[PDB]
């Protein structure tokens, strides 16, 4: 455990309910915060092909019915254990998972491990679990409507405001206790995550 765990985030939505965008610019708020990028996870087996420590990793399009194989790196990932991901396969060397913050999004209502214990370890690390709702005067055809939906309208983690940011055309909800963020929220508790895994306070208390 010499690793301080990624904070992680799950959005779980219909097809069209603008889960990838979603994912995209919560994670470039966040990279830009730590003047990182984000690196998208390639979803076949050697799957870091591009990974260069990036600050944010995103993984899309989780399916309901993990291999074990997924289920076991994201368990690493997500964790305090140091560990180098599968780079022989890409004749590069192995350089050491570093990333804080992993964002995945998911079509499935909830994901079922293979076993129950599988399934326990990957709700712990879920820290953020939230399903998104989507606007219904932003979405037609049951797909979110990108031009309505990124034109300008303050943020506290953006630049400029749009109805994406501020909770007008998408929302994210709470799985356990159902309260409500708009995008620019989530950034904020998210962010206050980071910093609340990296104070001093934090890390001397784990020594007892
Ligand atoms: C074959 N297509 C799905 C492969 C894989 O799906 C996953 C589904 C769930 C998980 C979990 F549960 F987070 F471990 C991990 C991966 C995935 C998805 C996205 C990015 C990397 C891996
Ligand atoms: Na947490
Ligand atoms: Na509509
Ligand atoms: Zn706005």
């Given at each position: 455990k010499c690793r301080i765990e990624p904070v992680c985030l799950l959005l779980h939505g219909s097809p069209g309910?603008?889960?990838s965008v979603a994912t995209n610019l919560i994670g470039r708020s966040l990279a830009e915060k730590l003047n990182s990028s984000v690196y998208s996870l390639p979803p076949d087996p050697d799957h870091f092909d591009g990974y260069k420590?990036?600050?944010v990793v995103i993984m899309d399009d989780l399916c309901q019915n993990p291999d074990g194989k997924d289920v076991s790196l994201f368990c690493q990932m997500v964790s305090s254990v140091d560990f180098?991901?599968?780079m022989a396969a890409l004749e590069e060397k192995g350089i050491l998972?570093?990333?804080?913050?992993?964002?995945?999004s998911t079509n499935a209502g909830?994901?079922?491990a293979?076993?129950?214990?599988?399934?326990?370890a990957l709700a712990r690390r879920f820290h953020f679990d939230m399903n998104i709702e989507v606007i219904s005067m932003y979405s037609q055809n049951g797909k979110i409507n990108m031009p309505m939906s990124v034109k300008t309208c303050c943020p506290v983690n953006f630049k400029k405001c749009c109805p994406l940011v501020c909770?007008?055309?998408?929302?994210?909800?709470?799985?356990?206790?159902?309260?409500?963020y708009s995008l620019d929220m989530l950034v904020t508790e998210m962010f206050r995550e980071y910093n609340h895994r990296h104070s001093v306070g934090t890390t001397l208390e784990a020594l007892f």
């Open positions: 309910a603008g889960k420590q990036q600050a180098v991901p599968p998972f570093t990333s804080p913050f992993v964002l995945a909830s994901i079922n293979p076993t129950v214990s599988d399934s326990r909770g007008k055309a998408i929302q994210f909800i709470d799985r356990r206790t159902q309260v409500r």
